[PDB]
Amino acid sequence: VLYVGSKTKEGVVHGVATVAEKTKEQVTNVGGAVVTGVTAVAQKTVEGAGSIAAATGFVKKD
Amino acid sequence: VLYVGSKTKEGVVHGVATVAEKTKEQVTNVGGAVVTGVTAVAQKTVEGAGSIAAATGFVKKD
Amino acid sequence: VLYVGSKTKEGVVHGVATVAEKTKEQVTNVGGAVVTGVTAVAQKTVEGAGSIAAATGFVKKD
Amino acid sequence: VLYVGSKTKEGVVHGVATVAEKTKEQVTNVGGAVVTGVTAVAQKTVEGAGSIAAATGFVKKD
Amino acid sequence: VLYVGSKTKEGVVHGVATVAEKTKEQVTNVGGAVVTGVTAVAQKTVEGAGSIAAATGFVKKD
Amino acid sequence: VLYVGSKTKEGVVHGVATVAEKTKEQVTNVGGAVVTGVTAVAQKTVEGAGSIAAATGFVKKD
Amino acid sequence: VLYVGSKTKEGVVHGVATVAEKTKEQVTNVGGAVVTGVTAVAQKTVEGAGSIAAATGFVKKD
Amino acid sequence: VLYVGSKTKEGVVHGVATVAEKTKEQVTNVGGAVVTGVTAVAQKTVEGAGSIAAATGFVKKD
Amino acid sequence: VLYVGSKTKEGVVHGVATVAEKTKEQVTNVGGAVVTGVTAVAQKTVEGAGSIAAATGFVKKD
Amino acid sequence: VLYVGSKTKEGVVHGVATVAEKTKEQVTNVGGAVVTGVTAVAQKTVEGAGSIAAATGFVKKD
Amino acid sequence: VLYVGSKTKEGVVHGVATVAEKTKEQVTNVGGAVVTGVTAVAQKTVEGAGSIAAATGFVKKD
Amino acid sequence: VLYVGSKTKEGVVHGVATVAEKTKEQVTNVGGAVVTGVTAVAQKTVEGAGSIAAATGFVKKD
Ligand SMILES: CNc1ccc(-c2ccc(/C=C/c3nc4ccc(OC[C@@H](O)CF)cc4s3)nc2)cn1
Ligand SMILES: CNc1ccc(-c2ccc(/C=C/c3nc4ccc(OC[C@@H](O)CF)cc4s3)nc2)cn1
Ligand SMILES: CNc1ccc(-c2ccc(/C=C/c3nc4ccc(OC[C@@H](O)CF)cc4s3)nc2)cn1
Ligand SMILES: CNc1ccc(-c2ccc(/C=C/c3nc4ccc(OC[C@@H](O)CF)cc4s3)nc2)cn1
Ligand SMILES: CNc1ccc(-c2ccc(/C=C/c3nc4ccc(OC[C@@H](O)CF)cc4s3)nc2)cn1
Ligand SMILES: CNc1ccc(-c2ccc(/C=C/c3nc4ccc(OC[C@@H](O)CF)cc4s3)nc2)cn1
Ligand SMILES: CNc1ccc(-c2ccc(/C=C/c3nc4ccc(OC[C@@H](O)CF)cc4s3)nc2)cn1
Ligand SMILES: CNc1ccc(-c2ccc(/C=C/c3nc4ccc(OC[C@@H](O)CF)cc4s3)nc2)cn1
Ligand SMILES: CNc1ccc(-c2ccc(/C=C/c3nc4ccc(OC[C@@H](O)CF)cc4s3)nc2)cn1
Ligand SMILES: CNc1ccc(-c2ccc(/C=C/c3nc4ccc(OC[C@@H](O)CF)cc4s3)nc2)cn1
Ligand SMILES: CNc1ccc(-c2ccc(/C=C/c3nc4ccc(OC[C@@H](O)CF)cc4s3)nc2)cn1
Ligand SMILES: CNc1ccc(-c2ccc(/C=C/c3nc4ccc(OC[C@@H](O)CF)cc4s3)nc2)cn1
Numbered sequence: 001v002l003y004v005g006s007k008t009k010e011g012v013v014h015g016v017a018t019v020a021e022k023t024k025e026q027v028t029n030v031g032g033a034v035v036t037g038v039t040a041v042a043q044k045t046v047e048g049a050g051s052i053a054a055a056t057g058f059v060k061k062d
Numbered sequence: 063v064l065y066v067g068s069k070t071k072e073g074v075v076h077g078v079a080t081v082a083e084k085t086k087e088q089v090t091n092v093g094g095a096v097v098t099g100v101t102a103v104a105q106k107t108v109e110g111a112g113s114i115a116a117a118t119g120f121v122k123k124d
Numbered sequence: 125v126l127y128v129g130s131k132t133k134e135g136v137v138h139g140v141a142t143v144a145e146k147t148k149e150q151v152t153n154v155g156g157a158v159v160t161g162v163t164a165v166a167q168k169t170v171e172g173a174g175s176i177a178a179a180t181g182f183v184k185k186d
Numbered sequence: 187v188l189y190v191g192s193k194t195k196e197g198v199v200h201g202v203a204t205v206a207e208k209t210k211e212q213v214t215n216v217g218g219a220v221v222t223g224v225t226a227v228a229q230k231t232v233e234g235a236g237s238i239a240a241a242t243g244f245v246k247k248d
Numbered sequence: 249v250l251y252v253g254s255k256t257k258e259g260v261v262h263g264v265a266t267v268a269e270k271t272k273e274q275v276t277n278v279g280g281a282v283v284t285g286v287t288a289v290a291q292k293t294v295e296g297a298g299s300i301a302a303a304t305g306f307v308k309k310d
Numbered sequence: 311v312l313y314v315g316s317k318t319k320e321g322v323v324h325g326v327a328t329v330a331e332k333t334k335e336q337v338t339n340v341g342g343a344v345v346t347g348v349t350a351v352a353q354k355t356v357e358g359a360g361s362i363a364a365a366t367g368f369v370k371k372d
Numbered sequence: 373v374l375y376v377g378s379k380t381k382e383g384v385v386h387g388v389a390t391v392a393e394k395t396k397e398q399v400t401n402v403g404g405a406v407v408t409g410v411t412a413v414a415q416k417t418v419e420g421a422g423s424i425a426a427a428t429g430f431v432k433k434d
Numbered sequence: 435v436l437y438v439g440s441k442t443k444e445g446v447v448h449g450v451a452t453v454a455e456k457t458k459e460q461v462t463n464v465g466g467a468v469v470t471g472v473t474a475v476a477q478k479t480v481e482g483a484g485s486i487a488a489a490t491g492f493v494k495k496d
Numbered sequence: 497v498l499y500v501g502s503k504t505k506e507g508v509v510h511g512v513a514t515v516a517e518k519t520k521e522q523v524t525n526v527g528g529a530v531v532t533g534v535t536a537v538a539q540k541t542v543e544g545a546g547s548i549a550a551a552t553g554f555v556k557k558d
Numbered sequence: 559v560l561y562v563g564s565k566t567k568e569g570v571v572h573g574v575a576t577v578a579e580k581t582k583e584q585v586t587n588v589g590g591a592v593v594t595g596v597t598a599v600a601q602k603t604v605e606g607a608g609s610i611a612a613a614t615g616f617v618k619k620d
Numbered sequence: 621v622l623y624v625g626s627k628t629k630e631g632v633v634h635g636v637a638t639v640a641e642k643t644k645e646q647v648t649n650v651g652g653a654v655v656t657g658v659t660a661v662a663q664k665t666v667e668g669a670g671s672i673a674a675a676t677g678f679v680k681k682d
Numbered sequence: 683v684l685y686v687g688s689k690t691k692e693g694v695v696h697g698v699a700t701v702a703e704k705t706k707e708q709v710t711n712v713g714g715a716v717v718t719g720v721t722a723v724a725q726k727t728v729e730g731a732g733s734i735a736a737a738t739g740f741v742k743k744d
Contacts, residue, residue: 007069011106011168015076018101019389019451021083032091032119032153040102042075049172050107053115055095055157060122063125070132073168073230077138079391080163081451081513083145094153094181094215101163104137111234112169114176117157117219121183131193135230135292139200141391141453142225143513143575145207156215156243156277163225166199173296174231177239179219179281184246193255197292197354201262203453203515204287205575205637207269218277218305218339225287228261235358236293238300241281241343245307249311256318259354263324265515265577266349267637267699269331280339280367288350290323298355300362303343307369327577327639329699373435380442383478383540387448390473393455404463404491404525411473414447421544422479425487427467427529432494435497442504445540445602449510452535455517466525466553466587473535476509483606484541487549489529489591494556503565507602507664511572514597517579528587528615528649535597538571545668546603548610551591551653555617565627569664569726573634576659579641590649590677590711598660600633607730608665611673613653613715618680627689631726635696638721641703652711652739660722662695670727673735675715680742 011044032057073106094119135168156181197230218243259292280305321354342367383416404429445478466491507540528553569602590615631664652677693726714739 018039027034033055043050080101089096095117105112142163151158157179167174204225213220219241229236266287275282281303291298328349337344343365353360390411399406405427415422452473461468467489477484514535523530529551539546576597585592591613599610638659647654653675663670700721709716715737725732 001063003065005067009071009074011073011104013075013102013104015391015393016102017079017389017391019081019387021387022087023085025087027089029091032094034089034091035097037099042104044106045110046108047110049110050105050112052103052105053097053100055097055117056121057093057095057119062124065127067129071136073135073166075137075164075166077391077393077453077455078140078164079389079451079453080142081387081389081449083387083449084149085147088150091153093155095157096151096153097159099161103165105167107169107172109171111172112167112174114165114167115159115162116178117159118180118183119155119157120181123185125187127189129191133195133198135197135228137199137226137228139453139455139515139517140226141203141451141513141515143205143449143451143511145449145511146211147209149211151213153215156218158213158215158220161223165227167229169231169234171233173234174229175237176227176229177221177224179221179241180245181217181219181243186248187249189251191253195257195260197259197290199261199288199290201515201517201577201579202264202288203513203575203577204266205511205513205573207511207573208273209271211273213275215277217279219281220275220277221283223285227289229291231293231296233295235296236291236298238289238291239283239286241283241303242307243279243281243305247309251313254316257322259321259352261323261350261352263577263579263639263641264326264350265575265637265639267329267573267575267635269573269635270335271333273335275337277339280342282337282339282344284346286348286351290352292354293358294356295358297358298353298360300351300353301345301348303345303365304369305341305343305367309371325639325641325701325703327637327699327701329635329637329697331635331697375437378440381446383445383476385447385474385476388474389451391453394459395457397459399461401463404466406461406463406468408470413475415477417479417482419481421482422477422484424475424477425469425472427469427489428493429465429467429491434496437499440502443508445507445538447509447536447538450512450536452514456521457519459521461523463525465527467529468523468525469531471533472537475537477539479541479544481543483544484539485547486537486539487531487534489531489551490555491527491529491553496558497559499561501563505567505570507569507600509571509598509600512598513575515577518583519581521583523585525587528590530585530587530592533595538600540602541606542604543606545606546601546608548599548601549593549596551593551613552617553589553591553615557619559621561623563625567629567632569631569662571633571660571662574636574660576638580645581643583645585647587649589651591653592647592649593655595657600662602664603668604666605668607668608663608670610661610663611655611658613655613675614679615651615653615677620682621683623685625687629691629694631693631724633695633722633724636698636722639701642707643705645707647709649711651713653715654709654711655717657719658723662724665727665730667729669730670725670732672723672725673717673720675717675737676741677713677715677739682744
């Protein structure tokens with residue numbers, strides 16, 4: 001009997017349970033960038049810029 | 063009997079349980095960058111800028 | 125009998141339980157950068173700037 | 187019988203339990219950078235600037 | 249019987265329990281940088297500036 | 311029977327229990343940097359400036 | 373304008389969120405009465421014995 | 435404008451959030467009565483014996 | 497403008513948040529009555545014996 | 559403008575937040591009555607014996 | 621403007637926050653009655669014997 | 683402007699915060715009645731014997 005092994009995890013989400021009970025959810029945006037309600041998001045990136053739930057406005061390079 | 067092994071975890075979220083009971087959730091944005099309600103987010107990045115729930119406005123390079 | 129092993133954890137969130145009972149949650153943003161409500165977020169970064177729930181305005185390089 | 191092993195933890199959050207019972211939560215931002223409500227956030231960074239819940243305004247390089 | 253091992257912890261938060269019962273929580277920001285409500289945050293950084301719940305305004309390099 | 315081992319801790323927070331019962335919590339900021347409500351935060355940094363709950367205004371390099 | 377009304381609740385459960393992460397859940401019963409794992413149960417009874425999650429053994433009337 | 439009304443609650447449970455992370459949960463019963471794991475249970479009873487999570491053994495009336 | 501009203505509560509539980517992190521939870525019962533793990537339970541009873549999480553053994557009426 | 563009203567509470571539990579981090583929780587019962595782990599329980603009773611987390615053994619009426 | 625009103629409370633528990641970090645919690649009972657771990661329990665009783673966390677053994681009426 | 687009102691409290695517990703860090707908590711009972719760990723318990727009783735955390739053994743009426 002040997003039983004050799006390994007179990008890994010990299011950017012793993014497991015076991016979430018959520019409840020949301022809003023009554024009036026409004027969003028008003030003029031020229032900006034809104035991000036809302038992200039939940040249970042997993043990612044893995046190699047040799048790149050990983051980024052979750054980011055926001056930017058007015059990227060004016062000149 | 064040997065029983066050789068290993069279990070790892072890297073940027074792992076597990077076992078969350080959330081409740082939100084708002085009655086009037088408003089968001090007003092003019093030219094900015096709003097980020098709201100991020101929950102249970104896991105990530106792993108290699109040779110890159112990892113960033114979760116970031117915000118910026120008016121990136122004017124000139 | 126040997127029983128050789130190892131279990132590690134790197135940027136791990138596990139076992140959260142949250143309750144939020146707001147009645148009127150408002151956000152007003154003009155030209156800035158707002159970040160709200162981050163919860164249960166895990167990350168790991170190698171050779172990069174890791175950053176969670178950051179905010180900046182008016183990045184004017186000239 | 188040997189029983190050789192090791193269990194480590196690096197930037198680990200586990201066992202949080204939170205309750206928030208606000209009645210009127212307002213945020214007003216003009217040109218700045220607000221960060222609110224961060225909870226149960228774990229991170230690990232290698233050869234990079236780690237930073238959680240940071241804020242800056244008016245980064246004017248000229 | 250040997251029983252050789254080791255368990256470590258580096259930047260670990262575990263066992264928090266919080267209650268907040270505000271009735272009117274307001275925040276007004278003009279050009280600054282506000283940071284509020286950080287709780288149960290763990291981090292580890294190697295060869296980088298670690299920083300939790302920092303704030304700065306008016307970074308004017310000229 | 312040997313029983314050889316070691317358990318360490320470095321920047322570890324465990325066993326907090328908090329209650330906050332404010333009725334009217336206001337914050338007004340104009341051009342400065344406010345930091346409020348940090349709780350149960352652990353960190354470890356190697357070859358970098360660690361800093362928790364810091365604030366600065368008007369970093370004018372010229 | 374009148375706006376006359378009323379909203380009631382009698383034995384009402386609303387807004388639960390649960391997570392269970394057992395690894396080996398065993399139950400052995402010999403002649404008894406086991407009750408396990410009741411969750412989010414609401415009831416209303418008029419002129420009768422209401423009873424939730426009850427147990428009895430050996431009801432020997434002679 | 436009148437705005438006449440009323441909102442009541444009688445045996446009401448709302449806003450629970452639970453996490454259970456057992457590894458080996460055993461129950462052994464011989465002739466008794468076990469009750470385990472009741473959570474978020476609401477009831478209302480009129481002219482009757484209300485009873486939640488009760489246990490009895492050996493009800494021998496002779 | 498009148499604004500006449502009333503909001504009541506009778507046996508109401510709201511806003512609980514729990515975490516349990518056992519590793520080996522055993523229960524052994526022989527002829528008795530065990531009750532465990534009751535949480536967030538609300539009740540209302542009129543003209544009856546209300547009773548939550550009660551236990552009895554050996555009810556021998558002769 | 560009148561603003562006439564009233565808000566009452568009778569046997570109300572609200573705002574609990576709990577953490578339990580046992581490693582080996584055992585219970586052994588022989589002929590008795592054990593009650594454990596009651597938390598956040600509210601009740602109201604009219605013309606009846608209210609009783610929470612009670613225990614009795616050997617009720618031998620003869 | 622009148623602003624007539626009243627807010628009462630009768631057997632109300634609100635704002636608890638608890639942490640328990642046992643390592644080996646044992647209970648052994650033979651013929652008795654044990655009660656353990658009651659927390660955040662509210663009750664109201666009218667024309668009846670209210671009683672929380674009571675214990676009795678050997679009720680032998682003859 | 684009148685501002686007539688009244689706010690009362692009767693058997694009310696609010697604002698507790700507890701920490702318990704035992705390592706080996708044992709209880710052995712033979713024929714008696716043990717009561718342990720009561721915390722944050724509120725009650726109100728009218729025309730009845732109120733009693734919290736009571737214990738009795740050997741109630742032998744003959
Ligand atoms: C600073 N923090 C750190 C630093 C380092 C670590 C760390 C480093 C290395 C490892 C290696 C884990 C391995 N597990 C197995 C399992 C089976 C196997 O099979 C071999 C094949 O020949 C079949 F027999 C080969 C391997 S290697 N784990 C954790 C964690 N945290
Ligand atoms: C800093 N954090 C870190 C750092 C390192 C690690 C880390 C590094 C290496 C490993 C390797 C895991 C392996 N498992 C097996 C299983 C079977 C196998 O089969 C071989 C084939 O010949 C059939 F026998 C070969 C292999 S290699 N795991 C984790 C984790 N975390
Ligand atoms: C500063 N903080 C730190 C610093 C260092 C560490 C740290 C460093 C190294 C390790 C290595 C862990 C390993 N586990 C196994 C399991 C099986 C295996 O299998 C071999 C294969 O031949 C089959 F037999 C090979 C390996 S290597 N763990 C933690 C943690 N924290
Ligand atoms: C300043 N703070 C610090 C500093 C250092 C540390 C630290 C450093 C090293 C380690 C190494 C841990 C290891 N565990 C195993 C388990 C099995 C294994 O298997 C080998 C394979 O051949 C199969 F047999 C190899 C290894 S190495 N842990 C913690 C923590 N904190
Ligand atoms: C200033 N504060 C400090 C400073 C130093 C430390 C510190 C430094 C080193 C360590 C090393 C811990 C190790 N644990 C194992 C377990 C198994 C194993 O397996 C070997 C493999 O051959 C299988 F047998 C190898 C190793 S190394 N721990 C803590 C903590 N705090
Ligand atoms: C100024 N304050 C300070 C200064 C120093 C320290 C300090 C320094 C070193 C250590 C080392 C701890 C170790 N633990 C093990 C366990 C098993 C093992 O396994 C070996 C492998 O061959 C299998 F057998 C190797 C090692 S090394 N701990 C604390 C703390 N505080
Ligand atoms: C000891 N604790 C206690 C004791 C008593 C109470 C309690 C008693 C009575 C009430 C009555 C509430 C009513 N609400 C409305 C709304 C509209 C309506 O419409 C009428 C129709 O003609 C249209 F206009 C008639 C009615 S009656 N509420 C609470 C609570 N708690
Ligand atoms: C001890 N606790 C207690 C005790 C009493 C109460 C309680 C008692 C009575 C009520 C009555 C509520 C009513 N609502 C309406 C709405 C419209 C309506 O329309 C009439 C039709 O003519 C059209 F206009 C008639 C009615 S009656 N509510 C609560 C609660 N809790
Ligand atoms: C010892 N503790 C106690 C004791 C007593 C109480 C208690 C007793 C009575 C009440 C009555 C509440 C009412 N609310 C309304 C609302 C509208 C309405 O509408 C009428 C219809 O004509 C339309 F206009 C009629 C009614 S009656 N509330 C609390 C609480 N706690
Ligand atoms: C010893 N401790 C105690 C003792 C007594 C009390 C206690 C007793 C009575 C009350 C009554 C509360 C009422 N609220 C309203 C609201 C509207 C309404 O509407 C009328 C309808 O005509 C529309 F306009 C009628 C009523 S009666 N509250 C508390 C509390 N605690
Ligand atoms: C020994 N300790 C004690 C003793 C006594 C008390 C106690 C006794 C009575 C009360 C009564 C409270 C009331 N509140 C309202 C509100 C509106 C309303 O509306 C009327 C309707 O006509 C619409 F306008 C009628 C009523 S009665 N409160 C506390 C507390 N503690
Ligand atoms: C020995 N210790 C003691 C003894 C006595 C007391 C005690 C006794 C009586 C009270 C009464 C409180 C009342 N509050 C209101 C509010 C509004 C209302 O509205 C009327 C309706 O007509 C609308 F306008 C009627 C009433 S009665 N409070 C405390 C406390 N402690």
